């Protein structure tokens, strides 16, 4: 059968595994990477943001970006053949179609990568936990780059593919949504920091409980991949950590499952929070404190100070952040503190 | 600035407010204040807690 | 000031799952003790 | 009607109990203020 030998050749053993998932992984991922590379080098953001984001205009690696399309265009797909561009590559680049090109192609490449992990696991006959772990980054990308702009006015408020653009996104969400106060973000940061903690502590514990399997100071050469016995003393590490901390692991399977579990659930909680923000359902104010401060000008906490910072950043940033609104704020209108 | 639970704070807004700007970098243990109330007014507990935590 | 319905939410969400987990552990230990012959039936 | 052949038991370690109790209490601590508002 024609299908059978094609499947045989796709699963051929070579330098890089192609597989059936490769058919949509490789072109989509290649196109997304190429779109980002051309975007941060030639195309500009003059007509969508009134910025300069390209090496051709004099930006370095930290400031070049592929900016989101103009807010005048709504949630349009910005297809090259669409009514907004009608072919004519130059205008398609100018109005900001490259952002949608990169985002859609990267999302499909991401789907292809998860499928590739599934296929590799099936071919090698192991359990697919790797795809489940990779489901975290997929959720983050979908919630931040797709769902959040979809809930907002247009693609204009999605993050832009660039170093400084992501920083602008961070500050924008902090100023407008009080994103740091959202409990789901707190869960996400807890998960991420715990993942880094687990990685470092497990690496150190394993490397410092090695067995005497050689005679040289370099302990890296006392290991062989086709080894049956364990290379480090689980008992000694367990005793050390139970004497120092008070609780220690006693099950390698549970240890490694915990290492898998922490960052993934952190990312999933953060994604839930971002989906909530997409509808402006933000954890912004504590009503009780806002009141009690309103009826008495002596009450103050760090919380109210954060609110003042948010108001300042919002008022001072809106004029240049949203050029399509034509915001004009006179000097006497902008909130400012004392002499500074 | 209030930072205690019994002064209309919750777990998130509550905090141990750092010492006063008037003190600056000066060492401010309990026995240098004239009263414990004054020590609390200028944020001595922050200095105590932070130095002990570092050690 | 604060919502007077949270009290119920916070307290029930703290107590009911905690008692559920304590129940699971107690029944696991009771079954384990029953399996092994001894003073406990 | 009859004795079902599919009835198994249920287990929970003490470490699992500690993890569950810690999770429930920490979730309550995190969300209590937001519920109170």
């Amino acid at each position: 059968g024609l299908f059978d030998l094609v499947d045989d050749w796709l699963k051929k053993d070579r330098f890089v595994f192609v597989g059936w998932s490769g058919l949509l992984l490789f072109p989509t991922a290649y196109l997304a990477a190429g779109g980002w590379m051309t975007g941060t080098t030639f195309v500009t953001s003059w007509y969508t943001h009134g910025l300069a984001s390209s090496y051709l205009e004099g930006c370095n690696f930290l400031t070049a970006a592929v900016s989101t399309p103009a807010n005048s265009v709504g949630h349009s797909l910005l297809l090259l053949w669409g009514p907004e561009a009608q072919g004519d590559f130059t205008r398609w680049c100018q109005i900001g179609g490259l952002w949608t090109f990169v985002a859609l192609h990267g999302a499909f490449g991401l789907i292809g990568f998860c499928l590739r992990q599934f296929e590799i696991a099936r071919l090698v006959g192991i359990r697919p936990y790797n795809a489940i772990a990779f489901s975290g980054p997929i959720a983050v990308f979908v919630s931040v780059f797709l769902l959040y702009p979809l809930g907002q006015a247009s693609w204009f408020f999605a993050p832009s593919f660039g170093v400084a653009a992501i920083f602008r996104f961070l500050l924008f969400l902090q100023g407008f949504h009080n994103w740091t106060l959202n409990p789901f973000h707190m869960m996400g940061v807890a998960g991420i920091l715990g993942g880094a903690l687990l990685c470092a502590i497990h690496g150190a514990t394993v490397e410092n409980t090695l067995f005497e399997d050689g005679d040289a100071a370099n302990t890296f050469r006392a290991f062989t991949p086709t080894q049956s016995e364990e290379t480090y003393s689980m008992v000694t590490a367990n005793r050390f950590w139970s004497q120092i901390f008070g609780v220690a692991f006693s099950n390698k399977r549970w240890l490694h499952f915990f290492m898998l579990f922490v960052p993934v659930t952190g990312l999933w909680t953060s994604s839930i929070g971002i989906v909530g923000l997409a509808l402006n359902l933000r954890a912004y104010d504590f009503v009780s404190q806002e009141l009690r401060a309103a009826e008495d000008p002596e009450f103050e906490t760090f919380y109210t100070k954060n609110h003042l910072l948010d108001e300042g950043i919002r008022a001072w940033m809106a004029a240049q952040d949203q050029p399509h609104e034509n915001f004009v704020f006179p000097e006497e209108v902008l909130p400012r503190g004392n002499a500074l | 600035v209030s930072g205690s639970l019994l002064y209309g704070n919750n777990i998130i807004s509550g905090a141990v407010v750092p010492s006063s700007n008037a003190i600056g970098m000066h060492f401010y243990p309990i026995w240098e204040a004239a009263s414990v109330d004054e020590w609390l007014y200028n944020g001595g507990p922050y200095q105590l807690i932070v130095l002990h935590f570092l050690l | 000031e604060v919502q007077f319905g949270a009290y119920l939410a916070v307290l029930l969400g703290t107590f009911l799952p905690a008692l559920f987990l304590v129940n699971l552990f107690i029944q696991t230990e009771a079954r384990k003790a029953g399996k092994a012959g001894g003073q406990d039936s | 009607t009859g004795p079902n052949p599919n009835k198994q038991a249920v287990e929970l370690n003490r470490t699992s109990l500690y993890w569950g109790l810690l999770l429930i209490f920490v979730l309550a601590v995190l969300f209590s203020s937001y519920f109170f508002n």
Binding site: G246 | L6 | T14 | R14, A28, V29, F36
Partner: peptide, 29 residues
């Protein structure tokens, strides 16, 4: 009155931590 709830939750968490250190399952080989 919510200060009582916050204090109760924090002390309960601390007690749970206490029981997980000195009343743990002893791991045997």
């Amino acid at each position: 009155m919510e200060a009582l709830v916050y204090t109760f939750l924090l002390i309960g968490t601390l007690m749970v931590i206490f029981f997980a250190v000195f009343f743990r399952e002893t791991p045997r080989i």
